[PDB]
Subunit: 982 residues, 2 copies
């Protein structure tokens, strides 16, 4: 018959771009088919919407033709049981893939055969229409019901609905879904993530009446000052048209109705032939509406009731309504008349352990974490999301960019399909069905045409379709240079603040220059910036300085939320930097006055308290709390009381922080939302050290210099020229000699795309390797020891040469005084023609392992020269475990900058340096592929650097360390004092 | 198997809007696959392009499921033989139709099964790709080759091509085409004509090499003054890419090459991923190019050769190239920098006797007739035309509007499908494949999105697609009010010159007012105006007065070329009016000076001669010829010699005409292209008639008045009050008494859409019938006879009453003098509340039938008060057959206006009147449905009117007779003199 696999699979609908669906129902906003207005208003579960999620039978096959014909009737004997909302690659069937014939797919196409046996109540079959909704099926699938072919579908990221009324029998039924891994639709979903396949979203049964609401959308119009609003709702019905049918739309704020409207069907005159008989538009007037924003997500409940003129209800639908206006005026993106500043992040749908299956708890966890880190916007990264995601963004407050599932970055012209009219029907379905589904969500403020697909005529056609259908939202699209005619917003990927990248035919201008190009009037919001891969996000403060200064630079979306957090949602150190740069309160210090400027556009600071503190080298001296009363975009001047003026040496530090005393929906009581630190006044130390009576004693041999003072003793290797050992009592303190270090375990930004096959000569790590920085051998030039009147002077000079070329010269002085202290002064010369070294400092392996690391310096978290703004100067005490950052691919990590004193066990290091301390050496971090293969070493590895190169972050494939953070001075000096507990 | 009818027809692809084709090749410009550059240059026939037109086997079936499975293998025994380029309704299978479930079609779907057995040479199968091209198949079809299913297609008006390489066997082959009458595509082709179905266009086989030219298009760029041009050709290839492949584009003017370019494959960098490896763009520089226009169609020959680097040719393609620029600047449509004035006409593809099958001879005949009537543009009425049509328009010179095959006027909202995104894929295919086929034709200057489909978002999306793909042509679309965002040109249908028609949501403003609406800057060109149905085209001069005066009124397209001509291409009388109003020479008379203004934009009057003539009441007095030397848009002042000044009574008339002494490609030597007439000087007649010695003798009875003079004698019925009989000798002259006439056989404009079921009360004929004008009975009020000193005076007064209401009163005076003459003075009163009568005059049936009709008056052709500008005053002699216009639906016809003297047999009528003379009475014309049922009556029916109502023409469904041409004065006077040959 024609329901058999041989007939159904003969036309190869998954290799035809002209066939994207068969017998699929129209797209629409979510429906629950409530038979009670009160249940619809309160969003209670509907008995007409039944979930088929649960245990299904599954069978895997190498190709679609390998599926036996008997599968259509009975479950296979070897078929196992799975939970249907899952990806079958997570169950170990074929290898998951993270990574051409444009219409055709390989013949070896893995096929997943799902089947479910379920019961249907006879009430559903007597009357009304029963449909099945597949929220997401990766690639393409064929559907059977009781052995009869139903339909076909593609576009994995949007729901596919089929009418099952003629197929369901009273009693037991069986569904058979044949999911294919690859189809012609895979060419439009060719992005960079775990590919995965299966029924990765919800499957449900919906029962609608014979006469039903088929579609509805709402529009909000406002007067000049937003004091009056009109809510227009257009309702479309399907089925038999009767003169006694009525539609009522009611607006509810909580439990009080604020507007209502009723009308029979029959719309306004459209054109010569007339108007829609099956449509009605209701206009509802709202006085002083509560506006929706990310700061204050005021939501109403709109209930759409289809009922008879007498008063009997047929069906009820409901949605949340937010009152807001989004438009671009004079080159600025305005929300409710105010210029938005986007604190955005890109977010893929990635479950911590279930792959691509999203659930409510993970979504709420993600939203809370974003808002607690001062994010106000999220970009739906390259496909429409789970329907519940948009509902949660309405309720908590998050601007959402909704993106069509179009991505063809693998094409060699990259517009080969988007400039081909034969692929226009395929791409139009992906754009139109997204708009039809999500147009009612207030959180969605921008439409996105897709990602990395070049620029073709299809983009222009689909851009104009959205503008015609929904003029209430701007349309953005990166592709073809991010400033084509198919975008209302210049949305470059990884454009830099000041440096231009003039690629042929698609230049990446600096964002400041991009704005002022001749004829350019649009606002600029970066769809992707600040690549957070590994130890990254250096120079993040540069972007937000530019965002504040330039009105038409209206923010951007940080790439990869999850990323800024690990898979278990543990935060990266760079998340703190993003939170600080994205604060809604800016601070200015002038004498004893603190000026607080609010960056909120709508809300008043009614849950805000300012706590200020003055400390001297980590010792608190005074503190106070002042309530915050700042209007949106206003300023509050706060006069500090008479601050302490200690006569002890040290630097005075003033720290302010904004604390929320009350808990919100997204934060708990005591939440810190903003902070800032300043230097107040420094008293330079002029006091001399105590006149120690003792003198260190120097012994000289042919192999070493030995300095002895009491129980302490130092040993310098005369052949190597480095301090080899130190003894307190009879206990050795070192396992590895203290030597100069000029390299670091390469970061992901240092490596770039330089694989072992496609080498990248411009990468930092390749230049360091070609210059011999990792292979340079130290050579001793001179080593002398002299006894002073109160100390012992050790002078050494080393040269680091690679293949007959001196790369670095280090001249070091060791001064061991009678008090036990050890002063180390280092002077380093770097050749100008060699690439700038990653660091200039010392390293050693301490024999002792200790539990706590105490230091007076910047930040509790790891920080780097270009990622230290969020860090604060104070006295920090952390366990040694927290001094190591567990990046997936091991690299240099755990650095703390601006440190004046470091304590570890009995050792104290004083000066002006950066340090990282851990159990893994830089050598081991360089050679270990994954962090689970890292093993702790015998002692503790300490890296103390006078100077350290910045980290990248503008992108991960090209060098992005700014010139002011490169070690290009040529000559460097730093001093260190090493003392003990005495 | 799956090639069987049961499997193929099971999915019902013709009821699915998402399936418009299966296995169809991409659209492209016409290809011949020449294997020789010289043959391509000279457009010789190619042996690689083989025509399958000829004798096929045909079988008709009521439904697709009625076709037996055996048809796929062998020809049916009862199948007859037909010529394949035909419509099967023309062979009498199902009734042709001239005149909803939006996706579904009726189950009774007539099916035409075509089959052909043909031979294939082995040379085609050993190497290369063999394809079959179906230029047009109405609705949808399935294709089989040797019993194997090939593909499916829709969009009747564009070619469908399929690859047959894997299906053809060496030797004899069989093709089976299953043509369905209705499909889902019929909803987009729901226009108003003979529906018809079958393979109505050419079927051919094309053989291309393994590596072939897959697509190419040319673009012309110009400097400011068009003295320098660049010809850019982008060539795309299909197949295996080799480094030794080359593409050469050469430009030829006649037999001399003027430009050439060669390059290997590999285009310019498009975006980040690179450029097209299978594309190459060649730039050719042309100095002082010969520009293309409708006036001077200068054509070049571009030859595209695909060849090896050594020099061996693989394949050659060619096309004609015209150098012209079309753009809209400051609200004006410019061609080569000059504002166009469109003398356009709508043209359907209608063969004189083969229905919808077009052949070259009919196309050339149509083009010649258009250009000979001063038309310069043609609108492809609602679908793409035969490919040869566009080639002929390039060569002869005609601006072409190419229209996509989208027409949904039957939808109740009329945008129900064009606002539905589910129908966007269907409509996009109809637009994109037309542009891909015809974008290289210079004659095509405007794209049209379709006809009468409302305005939806799909229109906006498809409008922007064309602008992106081909920015060299404007895009126009009537629908949604003719001024939406989906059109670059305001293109109303049947908008009036001065009167506004404010329909709800789609007003039809007057064209003068439409231009000056707030915010309106676009030019206005009427896509449809001056409905030529029946006796029509009244007020045509009003449109062309407005076209000349207003710069942004740039012409329009007259509806229905064929229409302006009959099916046999016999011209209508209204065609002369169109030719005169569309003249390219305008004339002004000032004293003895004629000012001639040229309306040509590019050409000089180098084939023009002005012949002037002065006549006195049709008697020539002087004549002369002056050569024309007028620059484009210039003026030539022509001083006439001393004109004759006759002292005889009468009016002097000056007639000028432009004659082309040399034959052109579209006209023969002696062609008249323009003319104009003026009144020069009138000498009023003051001489008295000769003093006749005789006196007519009056006899009075109770039944009649009898006047006798010599052999002549008149008889007046005293009961009726009308002249009943006149005798010359003993021969009666009348069969019907001379009576007042106030009605005419209703024109098509008089009837409107007033059917016997849906009555239209506003129609002119319905108001006349409701007022009783056709049923009014004359009542005699008074009738007296008096003998004068030299004449006999007869006075009558009649009243025409209908249901106790006097409609008209006629007071008539008869003065029979002694010379034999009969002076008739008529005074008529018309009630102000009754609708204005169609005419005011007399009628009678003369007993004599004569061969020639001689009159001194306006025009040789029939003319009416608002369609008389093209007519000329002179002495005309025509046979009685030419005095009748054979309209398909009989109506009032044959009127000649401005007549001072009419001669028919021995009778002469003098005065100032209009007349029509024929063998059919107005009563018979009103009751006869079709002209083939008209039968001549016993004598000759003469209608002499002092006054006559104008004819409509702005549209055919609403009253369109202007107020200045209605008979609204209330009181009317006219005089007539009736004499004989004595």
């Amino acid at each position: 018959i024609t329901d058999s696999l041989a007939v159904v699979l003969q036309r190869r609908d998954w290799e035809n771009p002209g066939v994207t669906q068969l017998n699929r129902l129209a797209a629409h906003p979510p429906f629950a088919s409530w038979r009670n207005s009160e249940e619809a208003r309160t969003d209670r579960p509907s008995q007409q919407l039944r979930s088929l999620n649960g245990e299904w039978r599954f069978a895997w096959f190498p190709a679609p033709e390998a599926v036996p014909e008997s599968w259509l009737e009975c479950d296979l004997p070897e078929a196992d049981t799975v939970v249907v909302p899952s990806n079958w690659q997570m169950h170990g069937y074929d290898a998951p893939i993270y990574t051409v014939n444009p219409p055709f797919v390989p013949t070896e196409n893995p096929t997943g055969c799902y089947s479910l046996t379920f019961n249907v109540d006879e009430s559903w079959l007597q009357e009304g229409q029963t449909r099945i909704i597949f929220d997401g099926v990766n690639s393409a699938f064929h559907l059977w019901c009781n052995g009869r072919w139903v339909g076909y579908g593609q576009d994995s990221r949007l729901p596919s609905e089929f009418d099952l009324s003629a197929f369901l029998r009273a009693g037991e039924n069986r569904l058979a879904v044949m999911v294919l891994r690859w189809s012609d639709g895979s060419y439009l979903e060719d992005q960079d993530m775990w590919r995965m396949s299966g029924i990765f979203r919800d499957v449900s049964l919906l029962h609608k009446p014979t006469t039903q609401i088929s579609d509805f959308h709402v529009a909000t119009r406002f007067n000049d000052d937003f004091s009056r609003a009109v809510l227009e709702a257009e309702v479309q019905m399907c089925g038999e048209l009767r003169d006694y049918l009525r539609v009522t739309v009611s607006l509810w704020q909580g439990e009080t109705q604020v507007a209502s409207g009723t009308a029979p069907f029959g719309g306004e005159i459209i054109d010569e032939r007339g108007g829609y008989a099956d449509r009605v538009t209701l206009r509802l007037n709202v006085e002083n509406p509560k506006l929706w924003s990310a700061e204050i997500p005021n939501l109403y409940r709109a209930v759409v009731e289809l009922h008879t003129a007498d008063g009997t209800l047929i069906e009820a639908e409901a949605c949340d309504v937010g009152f807001r206006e989004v438009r671009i005026e004079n080159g600025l993106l305005l929300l409710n008349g105010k210029p938005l500043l986007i604190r955005g992040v890109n977010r893929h749908e990635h479950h911590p352990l279930h792959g691509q299956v999203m659930d409510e708890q993970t979504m709420v966890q993600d939203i809370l974490l974003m808002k607690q880190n001062n994010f106000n916007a999220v970009r739906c990264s390259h496909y429409p999301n789970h329907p519940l995601w948009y509902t949660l963004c309405d309720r908590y407050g998050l601007y959402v960019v909704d993106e069509a599932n179009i991505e063809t970055h693998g094409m060699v012209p990259m517009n080969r399909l988007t400039d081909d009219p034969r692929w226009l029907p395929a791409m139009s379905e992906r754009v139109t069905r997204m708009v039809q589904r999500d147009r009612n969500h207030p959180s969605v403020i921008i439409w996105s045409l897709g990602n990395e697909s070049g620029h073709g005529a299809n983009h222009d056609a689909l851009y104009r379709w959205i503008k015609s259908v929904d003029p209430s939202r701007p349309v953005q699209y990166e592709g073809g240079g991010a400033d084509t005619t198919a975008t209302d917003i210049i949305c470059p990927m990884y454009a830099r603040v000041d440096e231009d990248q003039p690629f042929p035919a698609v230049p990446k201008w600096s964002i400041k220059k991009w704005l002022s190009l001749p004829g350019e009037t649009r606002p600029l919001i970066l769809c992707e910036y600040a690549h957070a891969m590994g130890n990254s996000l250096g120079g993040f403060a540069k972007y937000w300085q530019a965002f504040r200064q330039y009105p038409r630079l209206q923010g951007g979306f940080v790439w990869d939320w999850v990323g800024l957090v690990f898979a278990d949602r543990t935060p990266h150190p760079a998340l703190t930097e993003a939170k600080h740069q994205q604060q809604f309160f800016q601070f200015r210090l002038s004498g004893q006055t603190i000026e607080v400027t609010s960056e909120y556009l709508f809300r008043h600071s009614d849950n805000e308290l300012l706590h200020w503190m003055v400390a001297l080298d980590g010792k608190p001296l005074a503190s106070g709390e002042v309530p915050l009363d700042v209007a949106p975009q206003g300023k509050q001047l706060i006069e500090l009381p008479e601050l302490p003026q200690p006569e002890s040496a040290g630097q005075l530090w003033l720290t302010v922080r904004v604390v929320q005393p009350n808990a919100t929906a997204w934060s708990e009581a005591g939440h810190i939302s903003a902070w800032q630190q300043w230097r107040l006044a420094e008293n330079l130390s002029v006091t001399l050290p105590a006149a120690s009576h003792a003198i260190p004693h120097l012994t000289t041999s042919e192999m070493d210099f030995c300095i002895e003072l009491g129980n302490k003793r130092w040993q310098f290797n005369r052949q190597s020229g480095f301090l080899s050992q130190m003894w307190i009592g009879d206990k050795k303190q070192l396992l590895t000699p203290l030597r100069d270090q000029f390299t670091r375990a390469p970061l992901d930004n240092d490596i770039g795309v330089s694989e072992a096959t496609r080498i990248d000569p411009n990468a930092w790590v390749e230049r360091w390797k070609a210059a011999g920085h990792y292979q340079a051998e130290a050579a001793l030039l001179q080593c002398t020891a002299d006894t002073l009147a109160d100390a012992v002077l050790i002078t050494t000079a080393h040269a680091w040469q690679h293949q007959g070329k001196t790369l670095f010269i280090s001249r070091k002085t060791y001064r061991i005084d009678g008090s036990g202290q050890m002063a180390i002064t280092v002077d380093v010369e770097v050749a100008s023609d060699t690439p700038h070294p990653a660091r200039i400092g010392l390293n050693c392996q301490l024999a002792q392992v200790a539990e706590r690391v105490n230091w007076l310096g910047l930040g509790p978290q790891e920080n780097y020269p270009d990622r230290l703004t969020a860090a604060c100067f104070d006295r920090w005490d952390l366990p040694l475990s927290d001094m190591y950052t567990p990046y997936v691919f091991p690299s240099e990590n755990g650095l703390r900058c601006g440190t004046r004193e470091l304590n570890y066990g009995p050792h104290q290091w004083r000066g002006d340096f950066q340090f990282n301390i851990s159990r893994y050496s830089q050598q081991q971090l360089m050679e270990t592929s994954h962090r689970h293969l890292l093993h702790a070493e015998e002692g503790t590895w300490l890296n103390i650097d006078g100077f350290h190169m910045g980290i990248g972050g503008d992108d991960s494939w090209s060098p992005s360390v700014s010139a002011e953070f490169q070690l290009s001075a040529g000559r460097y000096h730093y001093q260190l004092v090493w003392c003990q507990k005495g």
